[PDB]
Symmetry: D2
Amino acid sequence: ASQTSFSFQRFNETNLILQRDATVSSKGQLRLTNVNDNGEPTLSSLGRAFYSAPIQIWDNTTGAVASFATSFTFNIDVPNNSGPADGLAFVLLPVGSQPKDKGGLLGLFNNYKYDSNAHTVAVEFDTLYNVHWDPKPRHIGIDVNSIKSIKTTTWDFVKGENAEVLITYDSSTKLLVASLVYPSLKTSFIVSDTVDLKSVLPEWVIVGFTATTGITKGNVETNDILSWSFASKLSDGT
Amino acid sequence: ASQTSFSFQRFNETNLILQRDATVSSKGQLRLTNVNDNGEPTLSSLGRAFYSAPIQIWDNTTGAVASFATSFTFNIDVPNNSGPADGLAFVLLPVGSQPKDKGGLLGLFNNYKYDSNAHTVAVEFDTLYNVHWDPKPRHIGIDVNSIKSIKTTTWDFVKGENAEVLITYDSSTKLLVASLVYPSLKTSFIVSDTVDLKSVLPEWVIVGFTATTGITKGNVETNDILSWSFASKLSDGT
Amino acid sequence: ASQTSFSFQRFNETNLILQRDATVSSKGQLRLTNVNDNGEPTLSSLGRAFYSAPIQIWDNTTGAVASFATSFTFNIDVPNNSGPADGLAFVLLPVGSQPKDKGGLLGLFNNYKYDSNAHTVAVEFDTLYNVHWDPKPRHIGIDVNSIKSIKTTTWDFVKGENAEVLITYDSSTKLLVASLVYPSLKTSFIVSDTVDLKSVLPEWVIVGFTATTGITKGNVETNDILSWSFASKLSDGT
Amino acid sequence: ASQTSFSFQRFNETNLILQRDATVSSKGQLRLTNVNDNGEPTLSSLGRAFYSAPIQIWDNTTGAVASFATSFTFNIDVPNNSGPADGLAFVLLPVGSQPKDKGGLLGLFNNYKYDSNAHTVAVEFDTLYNVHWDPKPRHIGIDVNSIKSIKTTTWDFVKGENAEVLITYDSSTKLLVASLVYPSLKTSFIVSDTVDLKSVLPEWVIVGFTATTGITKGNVETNDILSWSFASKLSDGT
Ligand SMILES: [Ca+2]
Ligand SMILES: [Ca+2]
Ligand SMILES: [Ca+2]
Ligand SMILES: [Ca+2]
Ligand SMILES: [Mn+2]
Ligand SMILES: [Mn+2]
Ligand SMILES: [Mn+2]
Ligand SMILES: [Mn+2]
């Protein structure tokens, strides 16, 4: 009834809305945070990227909510004598949404309080423990209007390893499932919770990614997206 | 490898680039040319509509060309005591492409001469005979860099009836096939001819529609798109 | 809701139901009629190949009818000093159906009268004119329980040239559309009419091909399928 | 190049190969193991069901391996005064494969030893702990030519609840991933390992399910499949 799907092996900036430090390298890689000339990630970075066509997530007339699935391969690497920070997230935001506060707030919030008017659904890949909200181990978290996830799962983060993610949303069950696998480590992690899109997001949203590096020294990482697939389906009724 | 596909039964301006007279009605119909308050098509009208995300048609490195297919339902109506003009088209144009001269040039050209710098591939639905270039009967025609179509086929145009269009392009054979059916009238029409996309179109193009009304009194039509689907695949090689 | 689609560039007998003279050559070609060791087609040959899984076309409980589409590439060649006969057809038949009479009856019917107990929907590619029912020119026809097509269209048959075919059925409008293209000759043909599947076919059917060579010397051809794609969708109401 | 996908919300025997106790109920549920007239599952049952068309997993000429995905929703329920047993499994088996020993071997193996001639890849959902090979808690397992799974993960089995299963296989990484979600409980589980299809399975296989009930009083369950989707893709090279 209304179908959108896109699939990219290599990125080009032509069909993307890049914000802040988010660039497209000559290799075709979506490098969300800054990396200098020597192949080294820099501190205090922030970058967001989006598919240039907004997607309809729901319709107020019909009452219908879209089911969507997305899959992406990312590489987060850390230079020597450093820990990682701060991570990356897949997001659904209002059209023309502008970057927020850097570091641990991932460019999505300005504080660690809940914001009913944030209109933000995100699946986070956290690489840093923030004492005021995060669980102690590194995690995958579902974020609904807060940096303090509604549900998390332990993620055994390993630097330099390609990570293959699948995020699915079934509107009939309201279940958002997110999974990560490391093909070389053969490891796998999954998290799931119910999210009521209709009450959180606007009818039209932009889809894509956001990443930030740490502000303190010794906490930094690359945040590269290597491939992306997205598909949503919204029923209007023949 | 690089897949893109979208399908709409109702239109909204949120995921479209609209140009000149093109509007989306409150019913959810992409109305390309101007219509006054009484539902009457107006003369000298030109409108263009595009999907907000550009599509990649070929790659310079890999040398590959995309295959694409598009289907849509259009309704051309003509008011009483008038004839039809000038027709509408499915178009592939450069990113940021601006409208051209109106009338029987369908907003794609400034004259009826070949123009290698036009970078224009279009499937036209011609409702008015232009002495200088068109065949006499109303026709479906394949346009490559010129309003004089490289091939045409007789289209028995009937006003106010829904026409269902399928346009397919095989890159392996370079064949562009365009067909039209009136599900009520049970009539079908088809035209096919070779097009080399690599030599005519830039790597990245916008996809969508153009339409114009007649400039002389007695020649005018509505140019409405009711539903639209598009899909294109481009191989990179894993 | 109930979706089935397949696509084969190369054929193998493992997933097909072959009948009579139908064979899969060592190249991966579906050779519907018989060909000797010299590479010559034999007279009075009959073959039929189907997909090994039956497909649901309609539901008696919901009343819902499937929308389907099939696309394939066939090669019909005529040896020296001969005419072409009789043709091949894409068919929908009851599960477990047996071959019928050969010749200008394409292995589908016993006679050239209408038969409501036949349960046969077919798109024919008729190369030989049969005085008793066919039109004089070579044609594409839509067969419903009779070899006398309900609708036909002229087909400029050329031997030894690859022919790409698209057959689409839309249950909302009950319209069946059939087109043929010759990629190298740039020629194209189309035929369309409505068909009420709900009254003709059983709920479950088999899909595939049927072919025959002529019974009289100097009237023979090859009937080959080089690739096949099929898709059908059937709503049940979530 | 060679693609097959199918999707069913209701079942019918027409397009499935049923073995032993496997039955398709009036409600349209694939009931793998036997259920008496009260609703009670019976002891020592075995049932297997398969899609009628065989699926090609690899080609010996090109050496190419297929990537496949499958999702199903199953229901396992236990009658009062009993524990569960023995489980159900999604399987890939050689064409014409016949059921093996019942009980904890799930109708795939004759003992609990590795058998290279088994030609059996299966994702199990084990509800009964077997001292000689199983991990203590109820698990999801990846089986390769042996009931002793190459990798497992704890699965918190809850009777009576619909479970949604996704199984993906990427032929480039040789990685198989299997996940289970309980939509109503919001719980979710995942496991992944490498499997070399080319060396284990034959060119063509039948895809589907197998299930067994316990041989000892007090250990029994229903093994119901409520919906099924399967997709595979094998590249010949254009
Ligand atoms: Ca954090
Ligand atoms: Ca004209
Ligand atoms: Ca004939
Ligand atoms: Ca067990
Ligand atoms: Mn966190
Ligand atoms: Mn024209
Ligand atoms: Mn005929
Ligand atoms: Mn086990």
